[PDB]
Design a protein around this ligand. Structure first.
Ligand SMILES: *[C@@H](C)[C@@H]1/C(=C/c2[nH]c(/C=C3N=C(/C=C4\NC(=O)C(CC)=C4C)C(C)=C\3CCC(=O)O)c(CCC(=O)O)c2C)NC(=O)[C@@H]1C
Ligand SMILES: *[C@@H](C)[C@@H]1/C(=C/c2[nH]c(/C=C3N=C(/C=C4\NC(=O)C(CC)=C4C)C(C)=C\3CCC(=O)O)c(CCC(=O)O)c2C)NC(=O)[C@@H]1C
Ligand SMILES: *[C@@H](C)[C@@H]1/C(=C/c2[nH]c(/C=C3N=C(/C=C4\NC(=O)C(CC)=C4C)C(C)=C\3CCC(=O)O)c(CCC(=O)O)c2C)NC(=O)[C@@H]1C
Ligand SMILES: *[C@H](C)[C@H]1/C(=C/c2[nH]c(/C=C3N=C(/C=C4\NC(=O)C(CC)=C4C)C(C)=C\3CCC(=O)O)c(CCC(=O)O)c2C)NC(=O)[C@@H]1C
Ligand SMILES: *[C@H](C)[C@H]1/C(=C/c2[nH]c(/C=C3N=C(/C=C4\NC(=O)C(CC)=C4C)C(C)=C\3CCC(=O)O)c(CCC(=O)O)c2C)NC(=O)[C@@H]1C
Ligand SMILES: *[C@H](C)[C@H]1/C(=C/c2[nH]c(/C=C3N=C(/C=C4\NC(=O)C(CC)=C4C)C(C)=C\3CCC(=O)O)c(CCC(=O)O)c2C)NC(=O)[C@@H]1C
Ligand SMILES: *[C@H](C)[C@H]1/C(=C/c2[nH]c(/C=C3N=C(/C=C4\NC(=O)C(CC)=C4C)C(C)=C\3CCC(=O)O)c(CCC(=O)O)c2C)NC(=O)[C@@H]1C
Ligand SMILES: *[C@H](C)[C@H]1/C(=C/c2[nH]c(/C=C3N=C(/C=C4\NC(=O)C(CC)=C4C)C(C)=C\3CCC(=O)O)c(CCC(=O)O)c2C)NC(=O)[C@@H]1C
Ligand SMILES: *[C@H](C)[C@H]1/C(=C/c2[nH]c(/C=C3N=C(/C=C4\NC(=O)C(CC)=C4C)C(C)=C\3CCC(=O)O)c(CCC(=O)O)c2C)NC(=O)[C@@H]1C
Lengths: 162, 172, 172, 162, 172, 162
């Protein structure tokens, strides 16, 4: 999985050499950055439920048809809603993973890879998620670096949905 | 590959759960203890040559049969080869020291290593000896109190030893 | 690969014999029934996307365990992967529909398919389910009486089913 | 084996795509062409014996030395003749295969591939076969497409013997 | 690969010993008998085509089943293939004749040869027959008294036979 | 192993062809050259002990520090000397191998390959060996071709130590 530390190893291993200083300096930057990030991760995880639910609704407001239109890809029913409640959980759960790892790696491997085909196949609409996401960005009550880091990965999840 | 952090995320994703406080506490002591990890790698890495060198001497010293006519280390090609392996192993170990995980060592270095040697006739046991010796040597260096800010390195050294042992146990 | 005709020639060459009247009669009813074959491929091919899509939904519907955290279809990479396999299978089947032979399906698609999945941990049985479902779906389309000149498609559908079943039996 | 149908699949499989219309149109052309061809195949197979034997002799006329000169590669003896009677059978049997398959594939795989080395090794002479072949072309009493197709593959067997 | 001389050096290095008088005597009779070796290769090599050719005829003569419809030599592709193998074998043998060692034959030619054929369905026994026949044929040529300075070729022919036999024993 | 004979085969085998005349002429040259060479090999082997020992000392003269300085890489002790006595044996034993094989192959495979890393690792010094070697060249009492060949391989061992 791609993380600052593993990229460094990957580089060194490619040229069959031990680790450089430059590389070492890189991991240190990652450790330094890891503080406010573990903080963002902890915060968001503790607010898990309210952000999910608060996110769920916000997507039934910007896109009302999802709550009415019949069809398995719609939240118009319970199991429909269950699914969407599950997906924002997955989205939320992913950001904190990136936060803990110091990179988009987690999100890349577990969500980003294959995102298109899957949205296209199940008739899922990006809008719905960029929406739930946009709500998370302005509802995590994070400040300073914790918010800087957090937001970075969120936007990444958006461009990836474009 | 996996690093200490990616490892924990792996285990959580597999249950689709967020990290538990205890998990967050673990990943945060790693970061705190960061600097110490860096010194270990930087130190082991910087002395790789002498680390390998001495282990070899020790090895052939206890096992002269390997450098007889035909033992497996006989002839510069084969001897050269052995030296390279000791370094390959070492190099992967340091990678593991920095990752806080042995995935990179296990995957790119240790797996199938036992079969490889067997096919070749190369005695695993002996390779394990050469590893067990680089271990003591490397831990003397990493954990040397001279020229470094005082503090407890025990946890880390224990981990570093873990890796080496893991390797010797994968070829013996 | 082999097509219905090349298959019969294969069997004759192997005895160094010319085709028997009965063999000539078989290859000539295939040609006569040609158009029907073409509609099947053209139809299945044209609806590949929806054919696959629906089968997937059905599958995860009966087997929610595959889309738990870690089941094998969990995560977009793996899910994407499953979708690709259903299409790979389908695509080869259509190739078989057109050839009048399963050689191309057996050789380029089905062989070693059972081992592959096993190594990966992927449950064959389930793949077979996803195949059994594309089958019903594809046969509904191919054999749909709307928009096509009336006539007996039974023989062909039976054959088309043969292929699908052949596949599910090669991974279960 | 190379046939119009299999080439079409081969093409589609190379680019990992389902079958096109162009491809489908191709198989249809093959089915349409398959009528007069199955007819040529049936005809020739029913005249198998007379064409073989009539062919056998015709090669003992244009090339008399084969009937006299001693040496296993010559029909100067029974087993020699047996062999040649066998070979025209093989040649005849091959044309009908191409006819049934709608291509030179059968002939390519079973006879053409390796033809040179084998003629060169056993001291076999192309002339003998282009001869037997030339007799088959003017002794199959075929007309219209049946003869068109038939002749096409025959000439192919000749150029391949050049 | 190894040649008669490199072979002896190999055996000495393995004991880290210098060549013994008896070893020096062996390598010096080889050199002395040189010219004879050269004539063998030059002769076998120059008649390779006819050597192979005749063996084939002989083979199919005793074993007509191989050239039935489907026997393994049936069809020009397969027949061509068999002819190629007889030459591949022959070619390696001559290499061995010149080296004074079979390493090149064993390594590049004979090893895994038995499995290969088995997988293919090709009957080893028969291949061995085709080899046993090229042997007699090749030894008639090499050891032909016409056009060559009189002298004892027995030792060499014995060796040449050794190689061929070695091959037939590696596929039967 | 690389020898005149094996190179010839290697060439022929690369292009999948039987052996040429040019190649054959090559082996003959090797056989012709093999006489005075087997002679050099026999001579040197019979003088094995005196050349080794005479070589041992000569390296304790040009480089006295090796006999005094403490440290396993030095002959300052018995086991140290044992090692060096062993190495000249190996060096001597190698030249005769090249002599018997008609090429540097033996020496290339058994000694040359890896020489640097090994000298560099065990803190061995080339000087010591080019020395022992230089003594062997002027102490083998060889003349004519026997000496020509012998010397050729010796110098090769030197350049390889440069
Ligand atoms: C074990 C190693 C024992 C020990 C260590 C100990 N080391 C430090 C602190 C630091 N080490 C470094 C070195 C680096 N940091 C990097 O990012 C890199 C890569 C470019 C290197 C080489 C640094 C910067 C520090 C912190 C500053 C300092 O010198 O204090 C400490 C302390 C604290 C901490 O962990 O940060 C300790 C206790 N001392 C021993 O005797 C050990 C054997
Ligand atoms: C099963 C499919 C059932 C059925 C079929 C039925 N179809 C036809 C005839 C034709 N189909 C085509 C279509 C193509 N021909 C091609 O070469 C290609 C590739 C470019 C395509 C897509 C054509 C041209 C015909 C013939 C002309 C026509 O429309 O009649 C027939 C009839 C005859 C025959 O086999 O030729 C039948 C009976 N009808 C059903 O309800 C089925 C489910
Ligand atoms: C077995 C072959 C029997 C036999 C041989 C016999 N041959 C020779 C001598 C020579 N053969 C050659 C030929 C070559 N030398 C080469 O280097 C090459 C490659 C370019 C070839 C083709 C030569 C030059 C000689 C020596 C000169 C000569 O003609 O005498 C001898 C004799 C001596 C010896 O071994 O040198 C003998 C006894 N005679 C038979 O009837 C055998 C069947
Ligand atoms: C002698 C000229 C001087 C000398 C030599 C010395 N050498 C070593 C150690 C080694 N030498 C080799 C070399 C080879 N090994 C081979 O198999 C071959 C090919 C046949 C060669 C050329 C090797 C591998 C070693 C190390 C392994 C071992 O101990 O056997 C030493 C010992 C170094 C040590 O630290 O133990 C010495 C002293 N020393 C002198 O002072 C002479 C001038
Ligand atoms: C030294 C402690 C002992 C020893 C070692 C020895 N090893 C080999 C050959 C090989 N070793 C490997 C191992 C790896 N290759 C890799 O890429 C990796 C991961 C990065 C590993 C772990 C391989 C693949 C080989 C074979 C390929 C090669 O030769 O390069 C040899 C050579 C054997 C030979 O005959 O060629 C030797 C001698 N030998 C000893 O006596 C020590 C006890
Ligand atoms: C929520 C914002 C809106 C909504 C969602 C909805 N999603 C699905 C179905 C699926 N969603 C995924 C996505 C993922 N699976 C993963 O493993 C990961 C990574 C952790 C992601 C991002 C998948 C694979 C499916 C289909 C498989 C399944 O059913 O689980 C549905 C159901 C569609 C159906 O036809 O059954 C719905 C309704 N719908 C809305 O209206 C919200 C606005
Ligand atoms: C879907 C019905 C189920 C499922 C599938 C799944 N498959 C894979 C991985 C591979 N599948 C193949 C199969 C083929 N490759 C071919 O080229 C062909 C012929 C054209 C076939 C039949 C291969 C080779 C792989 C591995 C290579 C790769 O990953 O691309 C996976 C991925 C496993 C992984 O961990 O990477 C999955 C998930 N999984 C399910 O849960 C469904 C029941
Ligand atoms: C006939 C026109 C003339 C003739 C023929 C003749 N042929 C052979 C021997 C062989 N012919 C073949 C050819 C094929 N074998 C195949 O499987 C196929 C594809 C189906 C072909 C085209 C082969 C392989 C042989 C040799 C093997 C064998 O004997 O079966 C001979 C015999 C040569 C011999 O030395 O025994 C003869 C005489 N000879 C004539 O005079 C006719 C004019
Ligand atoms: C002839 C005596 C008999 C015979 C032979 C036959 N062989 C093959 C196919 C192969 N043979 C080899 C062997 C080698 N390849 C090498 O590179 C080397 C070393 C240089 C050897 C020894 C291989 C690899 C093959 C397969 C690859 C290929 O087909 O080229 C065949 C063909 C089988 C097929 O179905 O394709 C045949 C017929 N057959 C007989 O009946 C004789 C008794």
């Amino acid at each position: 999985m791609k993380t600052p530390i593993t990229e460094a190893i990957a580089a060194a291993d490619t040229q069959g050499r031990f680790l450089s200083n430059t590389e070492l300096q890189a991991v240190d930057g990652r450790f330094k950055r890891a503080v406010a990030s573990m903080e963002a991760a902890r915060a968001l995880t503790n607010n898990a439920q309210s952000l999910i639910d608060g996110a769920a609704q916000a997507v039934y407001q910007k896109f009302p048809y999802t709550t009415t239109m019949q069809g398995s890809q719609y939240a118009s029913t319970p199991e429909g809603k269950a699914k969407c409640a599950r997906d924002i959980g997955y989205y939320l759960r992913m950001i904190t993973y990136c936060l803990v790892a110091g990179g988009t790696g987690p999100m890349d491997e577990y969500l980003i890879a294959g995102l298109s085909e899957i949205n296209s196949t199940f008739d899922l609409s990006p809008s719905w998620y960029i929406e739930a996401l946009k709500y998370i960005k302005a509802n995590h009550g994070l400040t300073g670096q914790a918010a800087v880091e957090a937001n970075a990965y969120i936007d990444y999840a958006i461009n990836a949905l474009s | 590959m996996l690093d200490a952090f990616a490892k924990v995320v792996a285990q959580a994703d597999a249950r689709g759960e967020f990290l538990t406080n205890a998990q967050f506490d673990a990943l945060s002591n790693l970061v705190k203890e960061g600097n110490k990890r860096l010194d270990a790698v930087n130190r082991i890495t910087s002395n790789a040559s002498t680390i390998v060198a001495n282990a070899a001497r020790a090895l052939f010293a206890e096992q002269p049969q390997l450098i007889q006519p035909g033992g497996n280390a006989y002839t510069n090609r084969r001897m050269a080869a052995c030296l390279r392996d000791m370094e390959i192993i070492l190099r992967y170990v340091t990678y593991a020291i920095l990752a806080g995980d042995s995935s990179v060592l296990d995957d790119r270095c240790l797996n199938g290593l036992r079969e490889t040697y067997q096919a070749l006739g190369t005695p695993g046991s002996s390779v394990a000896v050469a590893i067990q010796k680089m271990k003591d040597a490397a831990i003397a260096i990493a954990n040397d109190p001279n020229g470094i800010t005082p503090g407890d390195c025990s946890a880390l050294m224990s981990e570093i030893a873990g890796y080496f042992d893991r390797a010797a146990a994968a070829v013996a």
